[PDB]
A paper describes a structure:
Legionella pneumophila, the causative agent of Legionnaires disease, secretes the enzyme AnkX that uses cytidine diphosphate-choline to post-translationally modify the human small G-Protein Rab1 with a phosphocholine moiety at Ser76. Later in the infection, the Legionella enzyme Lem3 acts as a dephosphocholinase, hydrolytically removing the phosphocholine. Through crystal structures of Lem3 in the apo form and in complex with Rab1b, we reveal Lem3’s catalytic mechanism, showing that it acts on Rab1 by locally unfolding it. Since Lem3 shares high structural similarity with metal-dependent protein phosphatases, our Lem3:Rab1b complex structure also sheds light on how these phosphatases recognise protein substrates.
Therefore, we used a site-specific covalently linking strategy to capture the Lem3:Rab1b complex. Size exclusion chromatography and SDS-PAGE gel shift analysis demonstrated that the purified complex Lem3C134S_C209S_T391C_C395S_C456S:Rab1bS76T(PC-C3) (referred to as complexT391C) was present as a pure monomeric species. Furthermore, as demonstrated for Lem3 wildtype, the mutants cannot demodify Rab1bS76T(PC), permitting us to obtain a stable complex. Crystals of complexT391C diffracted to 2.15 Å and hence permitted its structure determination. No specific interactions are visible for the C3 linker region while L68Lem3 shows hydrophobic interaction with the choline group. The phosphate moiety of the linker in complexT391C does not participate in direct interactions with amino acids, but is involved in the coordination of three metal ions located in the active centre of Lem3 at the same site as observed in the Lem321-486 structure and coordinated by the same residues (D105Lem3, D254Lem3, and D394Lem3, D105Lem3 and G106Lem3). In addition, a third metal ion (M3) can be placed in the electron density, which is coordinated by D254Lem3 and D190Lem3. Rab1b:GDP binds to the hollow region of Lem321-486. As a consequence, the sequence R71-T74Rab1b of switch II is reorganized into a β-strand (β’β3-4,Rab1b) and placed between the β-hairpin (located on top of the fist) and the thumb. F215Lem3 occupies the position of Y78Rab1b, which is located in the hydrophobic pocket in the Rab1b-apo-structure. As a consequence, Y78Rab1b is displaced by 9.9 Å (distance between Cα-atoms), likely contributing to the movement of switch II towards Lem3’s active centre.
Author numbering:
A (entry chain A): 20 to 110, 113 to 147, 163 to 483
B (entry chain B): 2 to 34, 43 to 110, 112 to 173
Write the structure that this text describes.
Amino acid sequence: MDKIITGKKIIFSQSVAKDQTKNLSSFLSERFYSVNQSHNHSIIIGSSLSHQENDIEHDTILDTSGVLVTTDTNGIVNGARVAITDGLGGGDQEEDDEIYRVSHSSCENFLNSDQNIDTTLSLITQHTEASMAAFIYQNHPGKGYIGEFANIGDGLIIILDKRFKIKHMVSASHIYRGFGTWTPPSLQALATTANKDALLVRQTLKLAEGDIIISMTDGVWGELKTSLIAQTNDRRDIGVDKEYFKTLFDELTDAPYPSSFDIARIITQRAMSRSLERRKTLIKLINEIEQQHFHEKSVKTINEVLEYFIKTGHVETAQTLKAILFEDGLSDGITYFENIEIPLEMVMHDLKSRCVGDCSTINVTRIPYHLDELIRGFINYPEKHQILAPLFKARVKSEADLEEAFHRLSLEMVQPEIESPISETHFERAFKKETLDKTQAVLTHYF
Amino acid sequence: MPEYDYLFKLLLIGDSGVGKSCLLLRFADDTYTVDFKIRTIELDGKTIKLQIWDTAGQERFRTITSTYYRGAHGIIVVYDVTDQESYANVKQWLQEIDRYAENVNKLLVGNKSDLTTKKVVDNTTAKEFADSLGIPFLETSAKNATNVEQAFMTMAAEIKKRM
Ligand SMILES: Nc1nc2c(ncn2[C@@H]2O[C@H](COP(=O)(O)OP(=O)(O)O)[C@@H](O)[C@H]2O)c(=O)[nH]1
Ligand SMILES: *CC(=O)NCCC[N+](C)(C)CCOP(*)(=O)O
Ligand SMILES: [Ca+2]
Ligand SMILES: [Ca+2]
Ligand SMILES: [Ca+2]
Ligand SMILES: [Ca+2]
């Protein structure tokens, strides 16, 4: 049915020095876009990337997200293919263009295949790289919805039920490469590597009606509270703190049928709020360090820096520096060791060189209700009423179940423009009430 | 309009003090007395830009998460011909490459070859060990500039041959 893949987004990314006096609403409007396939699938894509002092004239978003909705022989929606990709590197427009090409083409080749996830990965893999988190789900007669999940790199997939209780998490992976360096697996590495199951996370799950599937690149989920799941000698598995993730959906508990966009917007707001606080804290810490002129005070190590701040009453500044260095407070993947002497110049060269933010993308998918989708096809394809009407005798348990299905349909919202800047997203009802009321009266009569 | 035809990332690894920074400084700036330098060379008509990193034991201070899964194109393992301990650790440096790093090009360098009255690492043994692993072997002197150019040029040529 519908196939949508996000387009290359290029924004003007102001420096942290100029975003420092910016509120969250202004930050989001300048940097983010929404793509909405329907009430039940939505994409938010943008860039929180920023240099500390220089503006980035052409900041290309190097993520891609896409969806293909599939149907049965009657045209009733019964599944979907979803993929999200994260182009590795970049942030030179020529170089950025080549990275985006691989990120976009990897997403589209996943969507365009008509194979199971294992065969699809074999076809799209066999020197720029992109990571990928992707899944396929389909209704199977006598079995219900089954979802196949694959994650390659440090994207993240989370599966929730209709009440936003976490059901499963397809964790992010880093592979240890020696010399203190960790790297997210890439899809292209999956083709040029001896060991495949080390780079690829696979899971197959039964899904229920109304389940929520959220896929995120690290630019989004890395800004939330994170949790180390496991770390072997060669592998690091990372996800979001599950206790913190549930508190995001506290905002939707009274919504009878929230759109995927509403779900995606709540998560993006929280991730970018934390990212905005982090970048303001960073440039504040660097200025407070430089104000001390440690070079002229024989302060040459981080431990001497921390003791200076603790002895002068600025213990909060010391604790902030410790969090950044030893707990990776900025979620940059850089962690200093606590039982060693660290030169201040090494840390200052690091801190002043750091960018903040990243390409940031999230897609949200709701697993459709079987009865609702039968009604959708019955309304959209009146020429097939002779084929579709007999199917109601096996999908309707009661008139109350019918009423519930029509209530969900009356709440559905669509974005006719499909794509727009996030502060220009215009939604309207998916159905006119007169259409649903006439259809519901017909089915109640036929019953 | 391109400024180069190839971009190769080279890594210098080895014990502290064997002369990795001096090899970097001699090859890029032609100086001697600093853990990253750039130099563009020409080779078979192609112009090859080299980004060379001295790891400099920064692994002892922090762990990092890079965005690329790809690693360096080539790794030069340096030891000190006057320090048998630095040669003994070469087998450990090579295991850290093999254990974790996709058929990277390798070169073994014995530096400080000008100190012939202090040279205790037998080059015959080092040559045969490198040959058993298919790794080319060179003795260099950053101080005298001996074989410094040839080492980085040979590494660049071997990377070009495998592309
Ligand atoms: N005689 C001699 N000394 C060298 C040579 N290369 C480096 N050195 C000595 O090694 C010291 C610095 O080594 P360095 O480049 O910092 O080693 P690194 O820690 O591996 O980077 C200096 O004091 C030099 O005198 C060489 O080719 N010949
Ligand atoms: C300041 C800067 O540009 N650092 C390089 C880091 C690359 N960024 C800009 C973070 C993009 C991401 O790399 P990968 O994690 O997709
Ligand atoms: Ca990226
Ligand atoms: Ca990323
Ligand atoms: Ca050095
Ligand atoms: Ca990353």
